[PDB]
């Protein structure tokens, strides 16, 4: 699916849920140029792109590359993505997916930063939390 003009949602046969984005070097070119000049006609590409065309024609044949933007693994196989401008009137537009083995889940873009800073810190806590319990339980065994 598309979230936007420049970004794409995709799933995998193997369960990866990813989102890609066209590079700003490409967005400037397509924003500043007409598509008719891409196939034939004059479009001025920076020196590196062409050197990647003669150097690596197989990968860079399409002359740009998606920088990985979001990547995730949901063990299911995602059947349907849908981008909803609002979920029950909520401001942040979400994208909800139904998996094949069955599931429905969402990816909510986080506004600001300290949202994802606090969330990131909480996830970091719960990540090794089992190890923290094990090290405390270890120290108390050193004292006992």
């Amino acid at each position: 699916k598309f979230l936007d003009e420049a970004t794409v949602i995709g799933a995998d046969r193997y369960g990866n849920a990813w989102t890609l984005r066209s590079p700003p070097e490409c967005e400037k070119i397509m924003s500043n140029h007409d598509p008719s000049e891409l196939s034939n006609g004059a479009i001025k590409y920076p020196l590196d792109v062409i050197t990647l065309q003669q150097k690596l024609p197989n990968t860079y044949d399409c002359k740009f590359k998606f920088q990985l933007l979001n990547h995730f693994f949901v063990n299911d196989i995602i059947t349907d993505f849908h981008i909803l401008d609002s979920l029950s009137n909520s401001d942040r537009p979400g994208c909800i997916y139904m998996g094949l083995q069955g599931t429905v889940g969402c990816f909510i873009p986080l506004l600001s930063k300290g949202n994802v800073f606090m969330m990131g810190n909480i996830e970091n806590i719960m990540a090794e939390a089992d190890d923290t319990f094990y090290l405390d339980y270890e120290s108390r065994k050193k004292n006992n």
Partner: protein, 83 residues
């Protein structure tokens, strides 16, 4: 000494993890490892197993699983041919 240890660890890792290309490995030997691991994961995840079951359209899902298991051995092609 060091490389000589890497030979022994080559024997051990090859024993545990089966196919590991050492230096010279025939395309028949290595591609077999490819097929075996791909089928291994297709049947290994209940997810992808459920997926291949429907896309293939088999009557039951375990038919697809044991199909992949059978498909791991080379002679299974001729086996299907003899049905």
């Amino acid at each position: 000494a060091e490389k000589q240890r890497q030979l022994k660890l080559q024997k051990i890792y090859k024993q545990k993890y089966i196919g590991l290309g050492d230096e010279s490995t025939t395309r028949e030997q290595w591609q077999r490892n490819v097929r075996n691991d791909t089928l291994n994961t297709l049947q290994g995840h209940s997810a992808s197993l459920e997926y291949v079951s429907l896309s293939r359209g088999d009557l039951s899902i375990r038919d697809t699983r044991i199909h992949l298991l059978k498909s791991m051995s080379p002679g299974y092609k001729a086996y299907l041919r003899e049905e």
